Amino acid sequence: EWSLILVNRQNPIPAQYDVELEQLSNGERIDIRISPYLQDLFDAARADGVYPIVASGYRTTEKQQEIMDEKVAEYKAKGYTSAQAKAEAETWVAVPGTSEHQLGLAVDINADGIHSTGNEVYRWLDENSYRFGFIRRYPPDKTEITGVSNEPWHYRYVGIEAATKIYHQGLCLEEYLNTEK
Ligand SMILES: [Zn+2]
C-alpha cells in the first residue's frame, strides 16, 4: 500500500518517486493525499485548545542536505571531529534520499508558542495522532530499531488502519511491516 512505504537508512526513496504537493498556508508542502487527514488532525487539536503548526513538511534533496549539514556543524562546535559529527547527526537528520520528509508524508509539528507549549502539542499528538492516520514515527523506546533519536515532533502518515494498530500494539513502522511478513 502506497501509505506504508518504508523510508529509512536501509530503504532510500525510489528514483523517480512522484509526489503531487499541496501548499499549506505557511508555505510548507505536503503530499496532496494526506491533506484532509492533516486538516482533521489540526482541527481536532484546536478543538481541544491545542494549537500546532507545521514546522516542516516536504523537503527537496538540497534542503535535506542543508539541514543535515547544519546539524553536523552543531556537533562540530560541541567538540566532535567532522567524521564523529556526521555519525552523530544521522541519529537526528537523515542523509538525503533517506528522509521521510522527501516523501511528502511526514510533518514536523511544533506548538504555535503563544497558545500552546511544545510539550502540550507533543503530548496531544502522542495520544491522538493515530485517529487521523499519523504515527509518532521515532518513539523513545524504539531507537534501537528505527536508528533515530526521540523526535516527538516528527509525524508520518500511514493511514488510519495501520496507525491505529501501530498505536495499540506500541510498535514502530519497521516492526509493523516486518510482522506483516
Ligand atoms: Zn522530521
Curated annotation (Swiss-Prot):
Top-level division of the source organism's lineage: Bacteria
Describe activation and inhibition of this protein: Carboxypeptidase activity is insensitive to beta-lactams since it is not affected by penicillin G or ampicillin and is inhibited only by very high concentrations of cefalotin and cefoxitin.
The family note in this entry says: Belongs to the peptidase M15B family.
**Residues engaged in binding Zn(2+):** H101, D108, H154
Residues in the active site?
E151
Assembly, in brief, is: Monomer.
**Its EC number(s):** 3.4.17.-
Q: How does it sit in the membrane?
A: Single-pass membrane protein
Which portions of this protein are annotated as coiled-coil regions?
A: none
> What is this protein's record name?
D-alanyl-D-alanine carboxypeptidase
Instruction: Tell me where it mainly resides.
Output: membrane
Residue window of the full protein shown: 88 to 268 of 268
- Cofactor requirements of the protein: Zn(2+)
